[PDB]
Design an enzyme around this catalytic site. Structure first.
Site, PDB file in Angstrom:
ATOM      1  N   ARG A  86       0.753  -1.046  -0.047  1.00 27.20           N
ATOM      2  CA  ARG A  86      -0.151  -0.019  -0.048  1.00 27.20           C
ATOM      3  C   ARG A  86       0.886   1.308   0.062  1.00 27.20           C
ATOM      4  NH1 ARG A  86      -0.969   2.505   4.178  1.00 27.20           N
ATOM      5  NH2 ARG A  86      -0.337   0.886   5.530  1.00 27.20           N
ATOM      6  N   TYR A 234      -1.175  -4.669  -5.788  1.00 31.38           N
ATOM      7  CA  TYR A 234      -1.093  -4.974  -4.289  1.00 31.38           C
ATOM      8  C   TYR A 234      -1.974  -4.496  -3.228  1.00 31.38           C
ATOM      9  CZ  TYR A 234       2.178  -6.784  -1.105  1.00 31.38           C
ATOM     10  OH  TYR A 234       2.510  -7.890  -0.033  1.00 31.38           O
ATOM     11  N   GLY A 235      -2.301  -5.460  -2.466  1.00 34.78           N
ATOM     12  CA  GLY A 235      -2.953  -5.292  -1.049  1.00 34.78           C
ATOM     13  C   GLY A 235      -3.946  -4.194  -1.303  1.00 34.78           C
ATOM     14  N   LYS A 243      -9.150  -1.320   2.820  1.00 31.84           N
ATOM     15  CA  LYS A 243      -8.635  -0.002   3.245  1.00 31.84           C
ATOM     16  C   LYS A 243      -9.558   1.083   2.635  1.00 31.84           C
ATOM     17  CE  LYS A 243      -5.582  -1.928   6.062  1.00 31.84           C
ATOM     18  NZ  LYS A 243      -5.667  -1.926   7.458  1.00 31.84           N
ATOM     19  N   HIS A 263      -9.447   0.833  12.401  1.00 31.03           N
ATOM     20  CA  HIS A 263      -8.259  -0.019  12.072  1.00 31.03           C
ATOM     21  C   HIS A 263      -8.172  -0.877  13.423  1.00 31.03           C
ATOM     22  CE1 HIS A 263      -3.913  -0.570  10.307  1.00 31.03           C
ATOM     23  NE2 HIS A 263      -4.628  -1.579  10.298  1.00 31.03           N
ATOM     24  N   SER A 285      -0.060  -0.321  11.557  1.00 30.25           N
ATOM     25  CA  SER A 285       0.375  -1.498  10.889  1.00 30.25           C
ATOM     26  C   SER A 285       1.869  -1.777  11.354  1.00 30.25           C
ATOM     27  CB  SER A 285       0.420  -0.833   9.267  1.00 30.25           C
ATOM     28  OG  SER A 285       0.732  -2.019   8.399  1.00 30.25           O
ATOM     29  N   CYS A 287       2.484  -3.226  13.847  1.00 27.50           N
ATOM     30  CA  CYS A 287       2.674  -3.148  15.609  1.00 27.50           C
ATOM     31  C   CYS A 287       2.047  -4.480  16.135  1.00 27.50           C
ATOM     32  CB  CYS A 287       2.255  -1.854  15.889  1.00 27.50           C
ATOM     33  SG  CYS A 287       3.256  -0.618  15.249  1.00 27.50           S
ATOM     34  N   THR A 290      -2.534  -8.645  14.350  1.00 27.96           N
ATOM     35  CA  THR A 290      -2.786  -9.818  13.905  1.00 27.96           C
ATOM     36  C   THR A 290      -2.298 -11.049  14.978  1.00 27.96           C
ATOM     37  OG1 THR A 290      -3.253  -9.338  11.742  1.00 27.96           O
ATOM     38  CG2 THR A 290      -2.621 -11.763  11.859  1.00 27.96           C
ATOM     39  N   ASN A 291      -1.223 -10.824  15.485  1.00 27.34           N
ATOM     40  CA  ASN A 291      -0.763 -11.715  16.579  1.00 27.34           C
ATOM     41  C   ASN A 291      -1.610 -11.629  17.762  1.00 27.34           C
ATOM     42  OD1 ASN A 291       1.433  -9.961  15.455  1.00 27.34           O
ATOM     43  ND2 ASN A 291       2.798 -11.990  15.766  1.00 27.34           N
ATOM     44  N   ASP A 310      -8.199  -6.891  11.797  1.00 30.04           N
ATOM     45  CA  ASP A 310      -7.859  -5.581  10.927  1.00 30.04           C
ATOM     46  C   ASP A 310      -8.731  -4.544  10.808  1.00 30.04           C
ATOM     47  OD1 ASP A 310      -5.498  -4.438   9.435  1.00 30.04           O
ATOM     48  OD2 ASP A 310      -6.973  -4.328   7.544  1.00 30.04           O
ATOM     49  N   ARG A 404       2.730 -10.944   2.422  1.00 28.51           N
ATOM     50  CA  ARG A 404       1.358 -11.274   2.911  1.00 28.51           C
ATOM     51  C   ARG A 404       0.888 -12.736   2.486  1.00 28.51           C
ATOM     52  NH1 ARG A 404      -1.209  -7.022   6.231  1.00 28.51           N
ATOM     53  NH2 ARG A 404       0.649  -5.544   5.900  1.00 28.51           N
ATOM     54  N   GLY A 521       2.104 -14.719  23.066  1.00 22.51           N
ATOM     55  CA  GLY A 521       1.245 -15.401  24.070  1.00 22.51           C
ATOM     56  C   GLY A 521       1.264 -14.844  25.387  1.00 22.51           C
ATOM     57  N   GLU A 522       2.372 -14.247  25.534  1.00 23.53           N
ATOM     58  CA  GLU A 522       2.584 -13.874  27.187  1.00 23.53           C
ATOM     59  C   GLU A 522       1.510 -12.714  27.568  1.00 23.53           C
ATOM     60  OE1 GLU A 522       3.550 -15.805  29.207  1.00 23.53           O
ATOM     61  OE2 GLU A 522       5.273 -16.689  28.510  1.00 23.53           O
TER      62      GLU A 522
HETATM   63  N1  GTP Z   1       8.440  -7.563  20.598  1.00 24.38           N
HETATM   64  C1  GTP Z   1       6.918  -7.702  20.299  1.00 24.38           C
HETATM   65  N2  GTP Z   1       6.795  -7.655  18.984  1.00 24.38           N
HETATM   66  C2  GTP Z   1       5.423  -8.160  18.633  1.00 24.38           C
HETATM   67  C3  GTP Z   1       4.359  -8.598  19.432  1.00 24.38           C
HETATM   68  N3  GTP Z   1       3.252  -8.902  18.582  1.00 24.38           N
HETATM   69  C4  GTP Z   1       3.725  -8.509  17.339  1.00 24.38           C
HETATM   70  N4  GTP Z   1       4.862  -8.178  17.195  1.00 24.38           N
HETATM   71  C5  GTP Z   1       5.763  -7.712  15.915  1.00 24.38           C
HETATM   72  O1  GTP Z   1       4.700  -7.103  15.307  1.00 24.38           O
HETATM   73  C6  GTP Z   1       4.976  -7.446  13.875  1.00 24.38           C
HETATM   74  C7  GTP Z   1       4.015  -8.105  13.186  1.00 24.38           C
HETATM   75  O2  GTP Z   1       2.527  -7.319  13.236  1.00 24.38           O
HETATM   76  P1  GTP Z   1       2.092  -7.174  12.002  1.00 24.38           P
HETATM   77  O3  GTP Z   1       1.177  -8.551  11.472  1.00 24.38           O
HETATM   78  O4  GTP Z   1       3.002  -6.554  10.945  1.00 24.38           O
HETATM   79  O5  GTP Z   1       1.184  -5.896  12.170  1.00 24.38           O
HETATM   80  P2  GTP Z   1      -0.364  -5.598  12.067  1.00 24.38           P
HETATM   81  O6  GTP Z   1      -0.938  -4.692  12.991  1.00 24.38           O
HETATM   82  O7  GTP Z   1      -1.178  -7.150  11.806  1.00 24.38           O
HETATM   83  O8  GTP Z   1      -0.488  -5.051  10.557  1.00 24.38           O
HETATM   84  P3  GTP Z   1      -1.156  -4.964   9.314  1.00 24.38           P
HETATM   85  O9  GTP Z   1      -1.598  -6.334   8.908  1.00 24.38           O
HETATM   86  O10 GTP Z   1      -0.347  -4.195   8.335  1.00 24.38           O
HETATM   87  O11 GTP Z   1      -2.575  -4.190   9.863  1.00 24.38           O
HETATM   88  C8  GTP Z   1       6.279  -8.418  13.993  1.00 24.38           C
HETATM   89  O12 GTP Z   1       7.284  -7.308  14.051  1.00 24.38           O
HETATM   90  C9  GTP Z   1       6.204  -8.734  15.380  1.00 24.38           C
HETATM   91  O13 GTP Z   1       7.531  -9.019  15.638  1.00 24.38           O
HETATM   92  C10 GTP Z   1       4.950  -8.654  20.759  1.00 24.38           C
HETATM   93  O14 GTP Z   1       3.845  -9.072  21.711  1.00 24.38           O
HETATM   94  N5  GTP Z   1       5.961  -8.357  21.353  1.00 24.38           N
HETATM   95  O1  SPV Z   2      -0.865  -1.567   5.783  1.00 25.95           O
HETATM   96  C1  SPV Z   2      -2.065  -2.126   6.299  1.00 25.95           C
HETATM   97  O2  SPV Z   2      -2.449  -1.652   7.583  1.00 25.95           O
HETATM   98  C2  SPV Z   2      -2.521  -3.444   6.221  1.00 25.95           C
HETATM   99  O3  SPV Z   2      -3.404  -4.187   6.648  1.00 25.95           O
HETATM  100  C3  SPV Z   2      -2.060  -4.109   4.570  1.00 25.95           C
HETATM  101  S1  SPV Z   2      -3.050  -3.361   3.195  1.00 25.95           S
HETATM  102  O4  SPV Z   2      -4.123  -4.001   3.383  1.00 25.95           O
HETATM  103  O5  SPV Z   2      -3.020  -1.870   3.304  1.00 25.95           O
HETATM  104  O6  SPV Z   2      -2.190  -3.905   2.081  1.00 25.95           O
HETATM  105 MN    MN Z   3      -2.490  -7.955  10.393  1.00 27.04          MN
HETATM  106 MN    MN Z   4      -4.037  -2.957   8.525  1.00 29.99          MN
END
Ligand code: GTP
Ligand code: SPV
Ligand code: MN
Ligand code: MN
Ligand code: MN
Ligand code: NA
Length: 612
Positions: A86, A234-235, A243, A263, A285, A287, A290-291, A310, A404, A521-522
């Site tokens: 993007r 792309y995306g 978006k 968001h 993004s 940060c 998704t985790n 998202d 992705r 997970g923590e």
């Molecule tokens: N140190 C640390 N890093 C984390 C944690 N959770 C996620 N991350 C980091 O965040 C990044 C992955 O998150 P993304 O999937 O890029 O973030 P998102 O918010 O889903 O972004 P978009 O999908 O683009 O909206 C990687 O750098 C991970 O290492 C955490 O609990 N601790």
């Molecule tokens: O950048 C973001 O926040 C995303 O979720 C990926 S994209 O949908 O903008 O490609």
């Molecule tokens: Mn994500």
């Molecule tokens: Mn996003």
């Protein structure tokens, strides 16, 4: 006989479906743009399995995707290295007045949006779209953002010359004939997309990936209900439901109609007592939304379930509950860094019916990326996203950092039972957070709604430098000042049961740049604290920044080596700097459009800090 010759009748070029079956305004949309773009073929998407397999076969035949032989119906697209994300610099919103879209910066450069005049766009449009689909198929994607048929769902029509966009949109949205039937003669968002590479090709093609970087422009015309995107496949530039629609257009509509498009991930969390609460979290993004959305909790008896990772649409119901739905149909997640450790549930989702973009390929037909945390057998080789042989010794990653996966939501092993409920889920807590390597403790709770909104406004990404208020910096559909005003007005809704507001920092580092918190997970230990605070447990200690956990309020068993002084520490010196910075930022970027209540909260924070 409504024509003197053939007219704008494109029937002769239809290779799937029928223009006669389309609602009138839909047909008008297709044929007007067919006339402009001059596609060789028109394909009205029905959304069937038959259509999807035939599409994948076509792309396989065209060399646009590779089958990943190690998994079940998984595929790989590799892009031009100039079309990998993007792209904010080419993203614009068209309105009559600039200030309706973005506040006027005192510096003369706005971080909060990018306005383009009607006049400038018309010139840009005319320089791009005429004949742009020459020799290509125009696919007509009828899609629903939100559960199909629901009155809170919003429908779009995406016209695209990219089969990769079609396949991804089938995953990321509900698409097909049933959408057209749900639409009838109703209003829809008009989405136009072209890769901007008419045949015969004028510039060379890289990795079978059609794109026009120089002419790349992603435009929004909210007053016309239009999204018009050119030059990127792309995306966020090309999957126009995500978006462009569900954030930019939808935040503007949400402002007009009394709801919210954000968001934010949505999760359901269940404690050992079987009590369940829903939470929404906005992180920028990269940060970690998704985790968290897909978290496997380390604490026994706790369960996390995913509604979405998202985008969230939220509004109050009659009873005062803030109700949230995920308008998406899948997850478009960052691949690098995804592992058994960081996101085990994603690992389980993405091994069937999944499309990967710009990850690496192993010699046995599997996927690879930095941070995957799985060793390969000796002898197994890797092809990078650049389609070259790759060794761990190389001076570049095997996968693009923004590579992705694109995966069906319903496939997630922890997808929430209510992830498709048309009534949405009741949000009891909203979590803000980002990357703050210094000064910002693991978690705090806002003092009030107004303080909560100020906390969202002060979010940061990218090493704790870049301001990304509410994780919406690149996504505001309108003036940020008015967005803040809209958030603040929520406290005046009668009988509104406002969620508690928290701020998290997974990213605090020590003096050597080591993470002070294990994360992933923590973070369940943090959500537990939040859960209790929602239940009104006496687990909070007042500070100048908000409520933090009391000593021993957080479960730290199994992590006895955590530097608690540094992680939870609050420095008068740091926070003086923080307010001064927020002041300069809001003065520069928001000024005359800043609601008084935000000014008051900055003063209030400054005041509490002065008493340290
Ligand atoms: N140190 C640390 N890093 C984390 C944690 N959770 C996620 N991350 C980091 O965040 C990044 C992955 O998150 P993304 O999937 O890029 O973030 P998102 O918010 O889903 O972004 P978009 O999908 O683009 O909206 C990687 O750098 C991970 O290492 C955490 O609990 N601790
Ligand atoms: O950048 C973001 O926040 C995303 O979720 C990926 S994209 O949908 O903008 O490609
Ligand atoms: Mn994500
Ligand atoms: Mn996003
Ligand atoms: Mn061909
Ligand atoms: Na390719």
């Amino acid at each position: 006989p409504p024509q003197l010759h053939n007219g704008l009748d494109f029937s002769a070029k239809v290779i799937q479906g029928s223009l006669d079956s389309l609602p009138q305004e839909v047909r008008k949309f297709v044929e007007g743009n067919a006339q402009l773009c001059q596609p060789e073929y028109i394909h009205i998407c029905d959304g069937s399995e038959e259509e999807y397999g035939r599409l994948l076969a076509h792309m396989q035949e065209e060399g646009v995707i590779r089958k990943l032989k190690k998994y079940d119906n998984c595929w790989l697209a590799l892009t031009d290295p100039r079309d990998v994300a993007r792209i904010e610099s080419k993203t614009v919103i068209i309105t009559q007045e600039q200030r309706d879209t973005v506040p006027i910066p005192k510096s003369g450069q706005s971080q909060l949006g990018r306005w383009m005049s009607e006049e400038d766009f018309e010139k840009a449009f005319n320089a791009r779209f005429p004949g742009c689909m020459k020799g290509r198929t125009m696919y007509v994607i009828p899609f629903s953002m939100g559960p199909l048929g629901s009155p809170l769902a919003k429908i779009g029509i995406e016209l695209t010359d990219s089969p990769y966009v079609v396949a991804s949109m089938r995953i990321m949205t509900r698409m097909g004939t049933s959408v057209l039937e749900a639409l009838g003669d109703g209003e829809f968002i008009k989405c136009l997309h072209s890769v901007g590479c008419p045949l015969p090709l004028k510039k060379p093609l890289v990795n079978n990936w059609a794109c026009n970087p120089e002419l790349t422009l992603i435009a929004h015309l909210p007053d016309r209900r239009e999204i018009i995107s050119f030059g990127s496949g792309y995306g966020g530039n090309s999957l126009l439901g995500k978006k462009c629609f569900a954030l930019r257009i939808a935040s503007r509509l949400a402002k007009e109609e009394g709801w919210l498009a954000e968001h934010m991930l949505i999760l359901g969390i269940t404690n050992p007592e079987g009590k369940k609460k829903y939470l929404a979290a906005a992180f920028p993004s990269a940060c970690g939304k998704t985790n968290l959305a897909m978290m496997n909790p380390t604490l026994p008896g706790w369960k996390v379930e995913c509604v979405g990772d998202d985008i969230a649409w939220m509004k109050f119901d009659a009873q005062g509950n803030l109700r949230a739905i995920n308008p998406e149909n899948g997850f478009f997640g960052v691949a690098p860094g995804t592992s058994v450790k960081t996101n085990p549930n994603a690992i389980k989702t993405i091994q069937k019916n999944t499309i990967f973009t710009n990850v690496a390929e192993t010699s046995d037909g599997g996927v690879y990326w930095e941070g995957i945390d799985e060793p390969l057998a000796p002898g197994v080789t890797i092809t990078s996203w650049k389609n070259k042989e790759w060794r761990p010794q190389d001076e570049e990653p095997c996968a693009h950092p923004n590579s992705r996966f694109c995966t069906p939501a319903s496939q997630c092993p922890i997808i929430d039972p209510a992830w498709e409920s048309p009534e949405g889920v009741p949000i009891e807590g909203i979590i803000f957070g980002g990357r703050r390597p210094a000064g910002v403790p693991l978690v705090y709770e806002a003092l009030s709604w107004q303080h909560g909104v100020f906390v969202g406004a002060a979010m940061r990404s990218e090493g704790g430098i870049m301001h990304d208020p509410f994780a919406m910096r690149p996504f505001f559909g309108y003036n940020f000042g008015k967005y803040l005003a809209h958030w603040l007005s929520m406290a005046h809704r009668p009988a509104a049961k406002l969620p508690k507001i928290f701020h998290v920092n997974w990213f605090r580092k020590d003096k050597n740049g080591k993470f002070l918190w294990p994360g992933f997970g923590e973070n369940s230990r943090v959500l537990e604290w939040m859960f209790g605070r929602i239940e009104g447990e006496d687990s909070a200690k007042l500070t100048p920044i908000g409520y933090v956990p009391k000593e021993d309020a957080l479960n730290l068993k199994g992590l006895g080596d955590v530097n608690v002084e540094e992680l939870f520490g609050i420095s008068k010196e740091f926070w003086e700097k923080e307010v001064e910075e927020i002041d300069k930022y809001l003065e520069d970027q928001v000024n005359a459009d800043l609601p008084y209540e935000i000014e008051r909260e900055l003063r209030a924070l400054k005041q509490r800090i002065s008493q340290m």
